[PDB]
């Protein structure tokens, strides 16, 4: 029955049907890849990033498509088109009660009036599924590991390897596709939680938000993956100083705030070495990039 | 009712925005002092009290371009080792951030306590020595 | 002594920086009104007097995120046709500049005059109708 299936969307666009209870690999579907100065896109939520180092755009790809044609404070123009597809799938054989899977294909073409011929493209495909105690589904960032722990208690039930990473878990509920929540973890983090505690208890040990940068056959792609203390983060651009002084705790943490594309001031550091510009595009986990201070102007 | 000083000193001239502050610092050749603070932070409140009730700091503050912000600035160079409050940073009129002017603590390079007023005075005098 | 409102309205809650105003408009989903003005311009002073004395504008302004500036911001989007003063520009909480909302002059698409109370009030009401997404 469709109700017992758990469709899993991976990076390369495949749709792997699994049993919810056991996780055994049923039929799989073959489709176009989910996603295709430079622009790096999150293939899970459609967020866009500016490759100053790396930053995050305040608009995801569907927003840019709906607002196209538009331009930002930097001067980059954005064009967008959207196109749907409605292939019908048999729940048993997985060929193209029946399954109604709708896919929206988003394309954003970015051209800058400064550089006349240089331009960039991007693609992002979203399944037409509404967003529907402990998190039941966990997906590894680098590998295609999928974990299913009990929402009632937090004990693992079945693990499955699918190859390329998992960017969405969907179920057939009422009579349509519905997107189940999932969390992205580093494989080392999942292993550490399994061996040390034995029961995953992610709310629905320090877990730190990092922006994993991965590379595949379609280009560079980012993903927001949690890590534990022990996962080697790629070194940041700046190592400030090995200062030795008394420690103070009488401060208050403050929100990050947006950041400007081009700096307005220089900087002088106290006897401290500055390194390469943060070396993004390295396979690994980076600190969360700052969101870029910008607006939009529909043309 | 709503004041630019926010309680850090009322007889002083404060700048509203970072860009106008940089323009003033470049034109008038006065170093820019930036105070990051929050109204819900008791540490910021105590430092505000000490800063406002210090004769020497108020006297020396007129030789600067002053700016206090409750929200993080758009400049990346103003938070070299984190975004926390209270945090006092200095900018040279050369539009060069004086990240070498630091406080007394190692984890928070630019955090001042309600006892480091002599250190704040020394750092302000050091900032007055233009590059 | 010196205030954030600069005489446009003292019972209103004003923002200090453009970026904090944008952040507040994003989190609270309220349209952002930016008034560009200069202390020297007599037109700016006249519009300030009219804006402050308008009770209908004062009551409606509490639903907005307010910001008045005397120095031009780096954002070019807030100067679609020049940097004259006074300008009143509206920003949708989706970080989109509402360039559709204009005054009564083709050359100066965002410059208002003291006789344009009703037009400015209707423009604010139109800005209250947030764009779709």
Asked if residue B4 lies in contact with residue C3, where contact means CB atoms within 8 angstroms, the answer is yes
CB pairs B-C closer than 8 Å: 58
List chains adjacent to chain A, taking adjacency as at least 3 C-beta pairs closer than 8 Å: B, C
CA torsion, ordered C18, C21, C23, C25, to nearest 10 deg: -140
SS (H, E, C) A198-228: CCCCCECCCEEEEEEEEEECCEEEEEEEEEE
Chain C residues within 8 A of A70 when measuring between CB atoms: 96
Residue A3 makes CB contacts below 8 A (sequence gap 6+) with A172, A173
Judge: C94–A296 Cβ closer than 8 Å, yes or no: yes
Asked if residue A181 lies in contact with residue A132, where contact means CB atoms within 8 angstroms, the answer is yes
What's the CA gap between C87 and C108, in Å, rounded?
9
For B22, the closest chain C residue by CA position comes to C71
Nearest to B111 among A244, A248, A259 (CB): A248
Q: What are phi and psi of A297, to 5 degrees?
A: -140, 100
Q: Nearest CA to B73 among B113, B130, B21?
A: B21
Judge: B84–A252 Cβ closer than 8 Å, yes or no: yes
What's the CA gap between B85 and B71, in Å, rounded?
10
Count of residues making up chain C: 133
Residue C51 makes CB contacts below 8 A (sequence gap 6+) with C8, C9, C35, C57, C120
Instruction: Name the β-bridge partners of A27.
Output: none
Judge: A73–C76 Cβ closer than 8 Å, yes or no: yes
Judge: C16–B23 Cβ closer than 8 Å, yes or no: no
What's the CA gap between B110 and B90, in Å, rounded?
10
Judge: A245–B104 Cβ closer than 8 Å, yes or no: yes
What's the CA gap between C6 and B79, in Å, rounded?
30
Nearest to A297 among C19, C94, C97 (CB): C97
In a mutagenesis test of the B interface, which of A53, A249, A265, A266 is the best target, namely the one with the most B β-carbons within 10 Å? A265
Q: What are phi and psi of B122, to 5 degrees?
A: -60, -40
Judge: B16–C69 Cβ closer than 8 Å, yes or no: yes
Query: Which run of H or of E encompasses C54?
Result: none
Judge: B4–C4 Cβ closer than 8 Å, yes or no: yes
Q: Nearest CA to A68 among A126, A129, A111, A128?
A: A111
What's the CA gap between C9 and A264, in Å, rounded?
32
* Pure H helices in chain C: 18-28, 42-53, 55-61, 117-128
What's the CA gap between A202 and A206, in Å, rounded?
11
Burial class (CB in 10 A: 0-12, 13-18, 19+), A120: middle
Q: What is the DSSP string of B59-85?
A: HHHTTSEEEEESS--S-GGG-TT--EE
For B104, the closest chain A residue by CA position comes to A245
Asked if residue A250 lies in contact with residue B43, where contact means CB atoms within 8 angstroms, the answer is yes
Residue C91 DSSP SS3: strand
SS (H, E, C) chain A: CHHHEEEEEECCCCEEEEECCCCCEEEEECCCCCECCCEEECCCCCCEEECCCCEECCCCHHHHHHHCCEEECCCCEEEEEEEEECCEECCCCCCCCCEECCEEEEEEEEECCCCCCCEECCEEEEECCCCCCECCEEEECCCCEEEEECCCCCCEEEEEECCCCEEEEEEEECCEEEEECCEEECHHHHHHHHHHCCCCCCECCCEEEEEEEEEECCEEEEEEEEEECCCCECCCCECCCCCCCCCCCCCEECCCCCECCCCCCEEECCCCCECCCCCCCCCEEECCCCEECCCEEEC
Q: Nearest CA to A145 among A162, A158, A157?
A: A162
Tokens of B3: 């004041």
Would you give the DSSP letter of residue B14? Answer: B
Q: What are phi and psi of B48, to 5 degrees?
A: -60, -45
C-alpha neighbours within 13 Å on the C-beta side of residue C76: 7
Q: What are phi and psi of C111, to 5 degrees?
A: -90, 125
Asked if residue A141 lies in contact with residue A212, where contact means CB atoms within 8 angstroms, the answer is yes
Tokens of C119: 């037009």
What's the CA gap between C8 and A121, in Å, rounded?
46
CB count, 10 Å around CB of B51? Answer: 24
Q: What are phi and psi of A249, to 5 degrees?
A: -115, 0
Judge: A254–B102 Cβ closer than 8 Å, yes or no: no
In a mutagenesis test of the B interface, which of C6, C9, C16 is the best target, namely the one with the most B β-carbons within 10 Å? C16
- Entry resolution in angstroms? 2.9
What's the CA gap between A142 and C52, in Å, rounded?
58
Query: Which run of H or of E encompasses C66?
Result: strand C65-69
Residue C76 touches partner A, C-beta closer than 8 Å: yes
b vs e for A252-275, b when ≥16 Cβ sit within 10 Å of the residue's Cβ? bebeebbbbbeeebebebeeeeee
Residue A262 touches partner B, C-beta closer than 8 Å: no
Q: Which CATH architecture has domain B18-128?
A: 3-Layer(aba) Sandwich (3.40)
What's the CA gap between A261 and A276, in Å, rounded?
18
Nearest to C4 among B3, B11, B18 (CB): B3
Residue B21 touches partner C, C-beta closer than 8 Å: no
What's the CA gap between B15 and B32, in Å, rounded?
10
Would you give the DSSP letter of residue B87? Answer: E
What's the CA gap between A72 and C123, in Å, rounded?
24
What's the CA gap between C92 and A281, in Å, rounded?
34
Q: Nearest CA to B101 among B78, B76, B69, B124?
A: B124
Residues 63-82 of chain B with CB under 8 A from chain C are 69-74
Residue A272 makes CB contacts below 8 A (sequence gap 6+) with A238, A239, A240, A241
For B67, the closest chain C residue by CA position comes to C16
Residue B34 touches partner A, C-beta closer than 8 Å: no
Burial class (CB in 10 A: 0-12, 13-18, 19+), A203: exposed
Asked if residue A193 lies in contact with residue A117, where contact means CB atoms within 8 angstroms, the answer is no
Would you give the DSSP letter of residue C132? Answer: P
What's the CA gap between B5 and B66, in Å, rounded?
9
Q: What are phi and psi of B49, to 5 degrees?
A: -60, -50
Nearest to C99 among A73, A293, A297 (CB): A297
Judge: C73–B17 Cβ closer than 8 Å, yes or no: yes
List chains adjacent to chain C, taking adjacency as at least 3 C-beta pairs closer than 8 Å: A, B
Asked if residue B20 lies in contact with residue C70, where contact means CB atoms within 8 angstroms, the answer is yes
Judge: C22–A258 Cβ closer than 8 Å, yes or no: yes
CB count, 10 Å around CB of B73? Answer: 26
What's the CA gap between C80 and C89, in Å, rounded?
10
CB pairs A-C closer than 8 Å: 42
Query: How far is the alpha carbon of C121 from chain A, nearest alpha carbon, in Å?
Result: 23
Dihedral angle sign, alpha carbons of residues C5, C9, C10, C11 = negative
CA torsion, ordered C111, C114, C119, C125, to nearest 10 deg: 90
C-alpha neighbours within 13 Å on the C-beta side of residue A30: 0
What's the CA gap between B91 and A268, in Å, rounded?
10
Q: Nearest CA to C41 among C114, C90, C109?
A: C114
Asked if residue A213 lies in contact with residue A53, where contact means CB atoms within 8 angstroms, the answer is no
Query: How far is the alpha carbon of A57 from chain C, nearest alpha carbon, in Å?
Result: 11
CA distances from A9 to A12, A102, A139, A146, C26 (A): 8, 13, 11, 11, 31
What's the CA gap between B109 and A247, in Å, rounded?
10
Place of tokens 């390194």: A275
Asked if residue A181 lies in contact with residue A137, where contact means CB atoms within 8 angstroms, the answer is yes
CA distances from B114 to A78, B62, B66, B117, C114 (A): 50, 21, 19, 7, 49
CA angle B75, C77, A109 (to 5 degrees): 95
Residue C43 DSSP SS3: helix
Domain boundaries, chain C: 18-128
Query: How far is the alpha carbon of C66 from chain A, nearest alpha carbon, in Å?
Result: 17
Q: Is the peptide bond before A38 cis (omega within 30 degrees of 0)?
A: no
Residue C123 DSSP SS3: helix
Query: How far is the alpha carbon of A37 from chain C, nearest alpha carbon, in Å?
Result: 21
Judge: A257–B83 Cβ closer than 8 Å, yes or no: yes
Q: Nearest CA to C116 among C129, C130, C101?
A: C101
Residue B74 makes CB contacts below 8 A (sequence gap 6+) with A257, A258, A259, A260, A293, B18, C19
Asked if residue C78 lies in contact with residue C116, where contact means CB atoms within 8 angstroms, the answer is no
């Amino acid at each position: 029955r469709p109700e017992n299936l758990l469709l899993v969307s991976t990076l390369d666009g495949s749709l792997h049907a699994l049993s919810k209870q056991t996780g055994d690999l049923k039929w799989t579907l073959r489709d176009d890849p989910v996603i295709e100065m430079a622009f790096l896109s999150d293939p899970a939520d459609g967020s866009l990033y500016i490759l100053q180092g790396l930053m995050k755009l305040p608009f995801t790809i569907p927003e840019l498509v709906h607002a196209s044609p538009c331009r930002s404070s930097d001067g980059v123009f954005y064009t967008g088109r959207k196109q749907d597809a409605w292939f019908v799938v048999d729940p048993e054989s997985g060929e193209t009660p029946r399954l109604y899977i709708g896919r929206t294909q988003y394309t954003v073409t970015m051209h800058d009036p400064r550089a006349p011929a240089l331009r960039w493209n991007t693609t992002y495909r979203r399944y037409s599924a509404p967003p529907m105690k402990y998190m039941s589904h966990l997906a590894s960032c680098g590998m295609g590991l999928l974990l299913t722990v009990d929402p009632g208690s937090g004990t693992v039930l079945w693990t499955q390897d699918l190859g390329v990473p998992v960017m969405g878990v969907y179920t057939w509920h009422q009579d349509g596709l519905r997107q189940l929540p999932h969390l992205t973890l580093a494989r080392d983090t999942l292993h550490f939680l399994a061996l040390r505690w034995g029961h995953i208890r992610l709310p629905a040990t320090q877990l730190l938000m990092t922006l994993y940068v991965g590379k595949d056959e379609t280009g560079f792609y980012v993903s927001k993956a949690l890590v534990h203390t022990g996962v080697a983060l790629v070194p940041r651009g700046l190592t400030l100083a090995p200062a030795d002084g008394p420690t103070t705790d009488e401060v208050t943490l403050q929100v990050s705030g947006e950041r400007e594309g081009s700096p307005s001031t220089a900087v002088r550091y106290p006897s401290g070495s500055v390194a390469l510009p943060s070396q993004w595009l390295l396979i690994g986990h980076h600190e969360l990039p700052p969101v870029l201070h910008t607006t939009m102007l529909r043309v | 009712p709503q004041t630019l000083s926010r309680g850090w000193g009322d007889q002083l001239i404060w700048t509203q925005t970072y860009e106008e502050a940089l323009y003033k610092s470049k034109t008038s050749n006065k170093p820019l002092m930036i105070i990051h603070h929050l109204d819900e932070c008791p540490h910021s409140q105590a430092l505000k009290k000490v800063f406002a009730e210090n004769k020497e700091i108020q006297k020396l503050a007129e030789q600067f371009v002053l700016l206090n912000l409750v929200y993080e600035t758009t400049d990346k160079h103003l938070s070299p080792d984190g975004q926390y409050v209270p945090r006092i940073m200095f900018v040279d009129p050369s539009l060069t951030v004086r990240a070498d002017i630091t406080g007394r603590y190692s984890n928070r390079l630019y955090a001042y306590e309600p006892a480091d007023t002599a250190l704040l005075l020394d750092n302000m005098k050091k900032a007055l020595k233009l590059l």
